[PDB]
Design an enzyme around this catalytic site. Structure first.
Site, PDB file in Angstrom:
ATOM      1  CB  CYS A  59      60.910  35.876  17.986  1.00 48.28           C
ATOM      2  SG  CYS A  59      61.622  35.378  19.569  1.00 48.28           S
ATOM      3  CB  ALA A  60      56.674  35.431  21.856  1.00 48.01           C
TER       4      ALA A  60
END
Lengths: 166, 174
Positions: A59-60
């Protein structure tokens, strides 16, 4: 000043927008398979958060925080643009659960959006995806901030994009 | 009296006619080539599978959490056969393949995305949906190629929500 991926130059087609320009219109696809254009967001400031993919294994998280912060500013929608299909967009860790953060896919019009925005990657593994960029539009779709990130792996200047809306 | 066989009607989605562009291949024709994208972001074409029988399992999207057991059994059975590769073709990005219900645990099934060449594959195969919510995706079809890339079986599924005749596609490889 070619954009790089891991420091390796890649080719982009089209011309990146300049501050002060009228933004190019588009027909992108929302998570319910309907078409989205500039008129779909009439009256709002818009953050086009343009990403090669939001469907990465990791996840960014910093992009989630930016999406939340920008969308919580007055009269602002964050439009997360990528080649990811709407089927994938329903699972994006950076957008799910956030009001006024709207996913918008390039799949239906192909390279049209990316080419109009100068983010059409034409070489290497990202060929056919968008490059990484943040473009902020006012209510009448004048570009008030535009950043083409020099290295795909790097974070945009999210502070500059947020401050353009203050 | 004799009644002429009906030309296949428009494909439907939930009973609703949809528009398709291109010409769907006939049995006996040479398959159109393509440049699709594999799970590692590299290009795939007919040459990538030279001399193999090929099953092109063409799907609007593979990115769903639930799917037909019959599809998985077909993908497994065809991929198990001698000198056969199953290529699952859709608009889904390679990034999504981790979620592909119908290919999970079937390591030999090859995913192949249309994203890099846009509508080229779909138009060449007569499965380019141009109307409604599936506009820009492929229709549902199964096309089986022999070792010299001649079409030996081809089904354009009449209703998107229905399953292909997997039994016919598999039996064409015997």
């Amino acid at each position: 000043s070619k954009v790089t991926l891991g420091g390796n130059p890649i080719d982009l087609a089209g011309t990146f927008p300049a501050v002060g320009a009228q933004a190019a219109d588009f027909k992108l696809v929302g998570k319910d398979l309907a078409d989205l254009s500039l008129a779909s967001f009439a009256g709002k400031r818009k953050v086009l958060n343009i990403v090669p993919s939001l469907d990465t294994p990791t996840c960014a998280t910093s992009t989630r925080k930016f999406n939340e912060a920008a969308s919580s500013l007055d009269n602002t929608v964050v439009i997360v643009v990528s080649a990811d299909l709407p089927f994938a967009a329903t699972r994006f860790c950076t957008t799910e659960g956030l009001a006024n953060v709207v996913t918008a896919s390039t799949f239906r019009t192909g390279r049209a959006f990316a080419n109009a925005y100068g983010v059409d990657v034409t070489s290497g593994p990202l060929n056919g995806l968008t490059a990484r960029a943040v473009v902020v539009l006012d209510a009448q779709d004048k570009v008030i901030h535009a950043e083409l990130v020099g290295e795909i792996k790097d974070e945009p200047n999210y502070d500059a994009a947020l401050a353009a809306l203050k």
